Amino acid sequence: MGASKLRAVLEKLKLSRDDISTAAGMVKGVVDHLLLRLKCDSAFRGVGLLNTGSYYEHVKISAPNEFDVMFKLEVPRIQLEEYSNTRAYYFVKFKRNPKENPLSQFLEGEILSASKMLSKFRKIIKEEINDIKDTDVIMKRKRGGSPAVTLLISEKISVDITLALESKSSWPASTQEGLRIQNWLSAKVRKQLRLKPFYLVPKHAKEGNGFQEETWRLSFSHIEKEILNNHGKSKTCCENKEEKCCRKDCLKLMKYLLEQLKERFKDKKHLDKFSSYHVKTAFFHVCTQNPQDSQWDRKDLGLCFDNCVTYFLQCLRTEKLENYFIPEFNLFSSNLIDKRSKEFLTKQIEYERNNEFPVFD
Numbered sequence: 001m002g003a004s005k006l007r008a009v010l011e012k013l014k015l016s017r018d019d020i021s022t023a024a025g026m027v028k029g030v031v032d033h034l035l036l037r038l039k040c041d042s043a044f045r046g047v048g049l050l051n052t053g054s055y056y057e058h059v060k061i062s063a064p065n066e067f068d069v070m071f072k073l074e075v076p077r078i079q080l081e082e083y084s085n086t087r088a089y090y091f092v093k094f095k096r097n098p099k100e101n102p103l104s105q106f107l108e109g110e111i112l113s114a115s116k117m118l119s120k121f122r123k124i125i126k127e128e129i130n131d132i133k134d135t136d137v138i139m140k141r142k143r144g145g146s147p148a149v150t151l152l153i154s155e156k157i158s159v160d161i162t163l164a165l166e167s168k169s170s171w172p173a174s175t176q177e178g179l180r181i182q183n184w185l186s187a188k189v190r191k192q193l194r195l196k197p198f199y200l201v202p203k204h205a206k207e208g209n210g211f212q213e214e215t216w217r218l219s220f221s222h223i224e225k226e227i228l229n230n231h232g233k234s235k236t237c238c239e240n241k242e243e244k245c246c247r248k249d250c251l252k253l254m255k256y257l258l259e260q261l262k263e264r265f266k267d268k269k270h271l272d273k274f275s276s277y278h279v280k281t282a283f284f285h286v287c288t289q290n291p292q293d294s295q296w297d298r299k300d301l302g303l304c305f306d307n308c309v310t311y312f313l314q315c316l317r318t319e320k321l322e323n324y325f326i327p328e329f330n331l332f333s334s335n336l337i338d339k340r341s342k343e344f345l346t347k348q349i350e351y352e353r354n355n356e357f358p359v360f361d
């Protein structure tokens with residue numbers, strides 16, 4: 001494509017940081033008061049803020065009125081029960097025998113109910129947003145699954161609040177062959193990263209005709225954040241002029257491509273199933289394929305970008321996009337996304353690439 005064109009796109013994209021940060025401030029305030037009022041309840045005592053997502057990864061673009069926050073909650077001594085070889089969805093039981101468990105009320109049998117937890121969560125949040133008349137914050141009717149609550153700050157800002165269980169235990173076995181960063185960020189880093197906790201968000205699993213509503217999906221957004229904000233083989237990568245790479249620029253460009261394409265065909269349902277996480281996952285795989293900083297030279301911004309696109313396209317055609325942490329978990333399976341959508345997105349991206357990306361202007 002050429003470096004300078006994409007770079008112009010990146011300038012135009014860079015112009016929104018001030019506004020996005022300004023809204024992020026208000027979000028921060030509201031969420032702060034919320035968490036302050038949430039820790040009162042015995043069930044959500046050890047609840048806290050989890051600073052992950054596009055904003056904290058410094059890759060959020062062109063959506064200042066939309067934010068996603070995650071609330072983490074420490075669940076000690078838990079036992080995970082894998083659902084139907086899905087490798088990613090789990091039942092949360094408790095290995096702890098005493099009734100000292102603060103989540104006993106949400107225990108539907110030996111298994112911890114996600115429905116009860118989410119219900120109490122939404123209830124407490126509703127009461128606490130009703131309690132405050134200082135700021136103009138209102139909840140929203142239930143729609144999505146993983147985004148538990150949806151808030152509206154003033155009558156402009158929109159915040160998606162997600163709840164996540166935190167486990168300081170060692171990661172599930174399905175993550176064993178994942179996080180292939182050995183040749184990129186070193187085995188040492190992979191080793192110390194796996195010593196960090198893992199998270200679980202309430203997400204129902206698709207069987208085909210019905211959905212299991214009492215399951216939890218693995219989450220490693222903190223690991224994604226760490227990797228993105230420390231992305232080079234060199235520790236001083238992007239800390240001086242001679243060591244400037246174009247990884248994050250490529251990620252931004254991909255995210256922007258998908259956003260613009262989703263916007264152009266928004267009156268249909270073809271691209272509704274695709275999200276930024278797909279793009280990010282593909283990006284991480286490309287990073288694994290090209291572990292050297294010299295393969296991400298600034299002047300090569302064009303080629304690199306194409307690389308990403310190319311790989312993404314491949315994932316579309318072969319209907320295979322492995323989760324970066326859970327290899328046997330396929331984000332692009334026919335169960336999750338139908339062939340027609342993938343072929344449509346392939347068609348569009350290929351057109352764009354064949355005509356110097358007119359969607360970038």
Ligand SMILES: c1ccc(-c2ncccn2)nc1
Nearest residue numbers: 218219220221275277278331
């Ligand atoms: C954080 C954000 C999104 C996701 C996800 N999005 C779509 C399909 C599967 N996972 N996972 C983690």
Ligand SMILES: [Zn+2]
Nearest residue numbers: 232237238245
């Ligand atoms: Zn770098």
